[PDB]
Subunit: 200 residues, 4 copies
């Protein structure tokens, strides 16, 4: 049961870096993108969201070239972002995949530098200003940025819905476990089809 | 490598509800508590930290009886807390287990009502006020409250050490998944022995 | 132009109505006495609370307290918290730290926890509880007009709440500081109202 | 005393819309800009900061055209921003004034939609990741965005230094009152000259 005036689709990091052949991180997520069909499922969800008047918010991650916005000695996941030169601002890799290119009305969330969309962006501000209380999440990575964003969403009292087949990760094991164990603690897990049915 | 003036031990939810026979949530965490020896490892870490002069911070979760500080219609993990009448303020369940009772000058973090300790407490305020930039995390649940806290601490630029043998969860597979896949993303995973050696 | 309040989406938030400010012998009471007296804030808050209960509106208290010795703060504070520390104000488990009797929390009132700074949103469970309960309108009162009350208003605003400031239920250490905050700052971040206006909206 | 490896200059809204003839809101701040000399003092501060190796971080405020990122029924100060059609993204007004144009190395904080730079941007994340514990603040508006940013900075444990002659408001009275009464509660106020000596 969805209220379009009080709902948003939040698309996390559908960027060529992940989504597209030649992306620095594409090879690592290919298998799961294939098994899930997340890309086409995401396209379908967005289409039904445009029609129902539900805003699309894209949340890309980017970094000024040289990574000066971060510690010179990162640890954990962002270390990989630095060493691999992923998501440099203004590059093909940082661009949102052509199939989901932002179009009239859509909101591109700004500032993302870490994994939790709510920790370095204007997402919370915009969601709250627009009176949105239900967020629908899709994107990358299932057990990293989608999971962090979902957990903070819950903390902040949104109704979080996670699109269990519009997410993808670097391994099927990591992907499946996130969805089976953690998603139910912090969200309402649903398929594109049921979200699509709910949007209509 | 640890600097005592700039380190905190953050002990999450060592409360009877989880730790003790009769706790509403004890049966769920019992197998993993026993498999890992978490209580005994935690007592060893805390003993060493006090010796080192490292402040010990307790982060209990509590709820005004009746759950009127929450939605009347919870979903996700907090639905079980309310439905199971867990962590009521002033009950034996809410009390910190006797083996880790706060002594002289220990800090007790106030406010927790959700999973991420940073989301509803004075933890950030106090760490920053004291100049703490490294946090050593232990407690319950591995894949819920510990992981949320770990994720937010990473986003806020803390050096987060996770005690791989001072945490527990409602299943062994869940516990193992978190430590193997997610902990390395947002923390420096360490055994208690490693942290003990670092503290001396 | 006339104010509508929905009881299910509304919360009175009372900042630091503790002896330390409100009552004779409180360490900071001398500094706020003139403005308390000028405004009649204490009685006015009582009348707004009473009406709030009658309409079923959550009353939320936001006291500030510190573990004795101030070991939860930097040893070398600056700014307004340096005065708290140096003055030994709001020590946990003292009369000064208690909420004032006239506004003692009764059955069902929420007592916000964690407060150690000035902004009520920065070190407590306030945001969590409001959002969990579905509150999107907070009515604000207490101390200090240009400090903690203003900080909470600013952040409230940033976080999408409809903030209402009770112009005659707040006080500061100076009438001049008080009046300036109310006339200049409050309208940028809030809808300032009187106790009487709020009470009428509640009924 | 200032450690360059632990300090950043944060410049709020040095955008043509305030600073320059033709800017929608320039008329309302011209008087105080003139009386303080804020623009030239800031250039001097930024130049000294560059020499010293201290990172420069500009925080512009922008909105996607049509103000759809916000409530359709704003109140308070943002209502004036929307009705005035100010700070529209990609327009000349939204651009940083030429004298303070970002130059190789400078960071441009992203996402600002509200008044407090901390509440809708990647400022905290970037400050904490780079290890900055002292922020030097200048810009617009003295009683609004500068005061909100300073209040939140202090809450978060930063040493906030406020440049009393590198800020401006719409009213001289409000400008002086904020500096006299509120700035001392939440910052160490200093003149540009005194900050430049410390930077030098």
């Amino acid at each position: 049961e969805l209220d379009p005036a009080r709902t948003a689709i939040v698309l996390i990091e559908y960027q060529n870096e992940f989504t597209s052949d030649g992306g620095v991180l594409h090879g690592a997520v290919a298998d799961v993108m294939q098994h899930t069909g997340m890309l086409a499922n995401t396209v379908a969800v967005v289409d039904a969201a445009r029609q129902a008047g539900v805003p699309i918010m894209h949340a890309p991650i980017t970094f000024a070239e040289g990574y000066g916005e971060l510690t010179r000695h990162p640890y954990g996941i962002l270390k990989g972002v630095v060493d691999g030169k992923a998501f440099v601002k203004g590059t093909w890799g940082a661009a949102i995949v052509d199939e989901l290119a932002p179009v009239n009305g859509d909101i591109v969330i700004e500032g993302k530098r870490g994994l939790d969309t709510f920790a370095s962006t204007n997402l919370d501000f915009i969601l709250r200003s627009k009176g949105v209380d239900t967020i629908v999440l899709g994107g990358f990575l299932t057990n990293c940025c989608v999971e962090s964003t979902m957990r903070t969403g819950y903390e902040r009292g949104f109704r979080v819905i996670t699109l269990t087949d519009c997410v993808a990760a670097t391994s099927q094991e990591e992907h499946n476990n996130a969805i089976s164990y953690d998603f139910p603690m912090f969200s309402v897990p649903m398929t594109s089809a049921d979200v699509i049915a709910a949007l209509e």
